[PDB]
Amino acid sequence: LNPLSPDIWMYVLLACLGVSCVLFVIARFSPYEWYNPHPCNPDSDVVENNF
């Protein structure tokens, strides 16, 4: 753990939980991530996210 300062090991882990929460919110806010996981048969209101 020596090649990075203990300021940096906390700032990576705080950004690891930070970007994870932003990418979850920004995928639900976006309409393009909503689609069907069943492309074989046609639509039966099966629009579903993955995140």
Binding site: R28, F29, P31, W34, N49
Partner: peptide, 14 residues
């Protein structure tokens, strides 16, 4: 029409 589907994606359950 944006206020229709903004609650569809703030569905809060799934």
């Amino acid at each position: 029409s944006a206020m229709v589907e903004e609650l569809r994606m703030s569905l809060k359950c799934q």
